Structure 1
Amino acid sequence: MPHAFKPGDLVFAKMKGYPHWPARIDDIADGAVKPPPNKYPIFFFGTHETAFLGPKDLFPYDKSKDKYGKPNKRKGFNEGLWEIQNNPHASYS
């Protein structure tokens, strides 16, 4: 059975106006800005941007990849597909 989201989990993350996007739940570094309550720090592959999202916008990657893991014209997206498949736990900073 599912657990709650934890750092390192792989997802497609949904933002309004953008396609479901390859991403991971990030850790929060010592001394770094924390997310609001009930929100997670989402690192988007390809763009390497961070937004704070709740579970309603997080789709576990294994379950969702057949639907959402197809190339997309949007900037950064196809790089993001490579990262999530090939090195999802690397440092991209």
Structure 2
Amino acid sequence: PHAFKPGDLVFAKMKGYPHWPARIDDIADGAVKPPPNKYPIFFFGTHETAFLGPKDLFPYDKCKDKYGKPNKRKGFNEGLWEIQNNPHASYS
């Protein structure tokens, strides 16, 4: 098993939110230097971005049984559709 790379599918954990379907984005695409050992995360559904370290990143194939369940939070269910059906699309 390897370090996280752009295009990796995850659930990403932030405080006040459930584990959220997300992907690792490419930094070589932005014009922004990431904090040390943090990754640019794109959240499905909301189409928001944040920087998160590996402790908040849960690989999607391993964790979807547990986290890949409908939620009432705004964007979550759309985000589930997007990660399962077109995770690598332009949502921009």
TM-score of the pair, normalised by structure 2: 0.96
Where do 5+ consecutive residues of structure 2 fail to align?
none
CA distance in 2, matches of 1:89, 1:31: 16
Give CA deviations for 1:45-93 in whole Å, capped at 9, x if unaligned: 0000000000000000000000000000000000000000000000000
Deviation at 1:35, TM superposition (A): 1.3
Deviation at 1:30, TM superposition (A): 4.4
What is the number of equivalent residue pairs in this alignment? 92
CA distance in 2, matches of 1:47, 1:31: 19
Q: Describe how 1:1-93 pairs up with structure 2 within 5 A.
A: 2-30=1-29, 32-93=31-92
- Distance change (3 Å), C-alpha of 1:78 and 1:34: same
Would you identify which runs of 4 or more consecutive aligned residues in structure 1 move more than 2 Å? Answer: none
